[PDB]
Each structure stands twice: as C-alpha cells, then as structure tokens.
C-alpha cells in the first residue's frame, strides 16, 4: 500500500505540541493507520502530536534523531530533517526513504 502524509504537530516537548509544524508518512491496513516518520523543517523535535480518532484527546510519539538531507527549491537548498518514529522497523524505514527521495 502507498506511503500517504499528512500535517501534524511536533515538538522538542510534549507541552511544546501545539500547532501543526511538520509532515507524518503513514500507512494504512486492517489494524487502522500507523505513523512511521515525521519530515519537518525543525532540527530540534522529540515528540509528535495526534488528534486522538475518537476525540477523547492526544497522542504522544517519541522520535527518533533527525536525518539531514539538503533539498533544491525555487529559492535554493534547504535542510529538512526526517525523524523515524522511534523503534521502526527497517522494511518501514526503507518505505520512508524510498518514498522521499523518489518525490523529492
């Protein structure tokens, strides 16, 4: 199935979660969505935020150190860091990978 993104929050604190700052790469399957990466302009995030499905509040997931890779844009480089949820496995952080230097 297609890796699919979707804006999200994130911060460098749980209480730092606030307004949506960074792009989540999630599958979906029988058991519902799982979240496997967050992409963001921010070097410094430690936890993603999620709207929990039934309302009730909000999900906290830790992250795992930022990879750095540079981007061309019609303004020129830019870094951009790719943080894999912590614990991935490596069929889902090769489906990241693949996914983003495909697009990008």
Partial sequence: VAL???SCAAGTTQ???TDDN???YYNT???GR????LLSD????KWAR???????????????PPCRFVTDTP???????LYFIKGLNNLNRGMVLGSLAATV
């Fill in 42 to 45: 921010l070097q410094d995030l």
């Fill in 50 to 64: 999620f709207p929990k499905s039934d309302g009730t509040g909000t999900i906290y997931t830790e992250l795992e």
């Fill in 15 to 17: 209480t730092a979660c």
């Fill in 4 to 6: 699919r993104q979707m």
């Fill in 75 to 81: 303004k020129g480089p830019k870094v951009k860091y």
């Fill in 34 to 37: 799982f979240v496997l990466a």
């Fill in 29 to 31: 399957t029988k058991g």
């Fill in 22 to 24: 960074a792009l989540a």
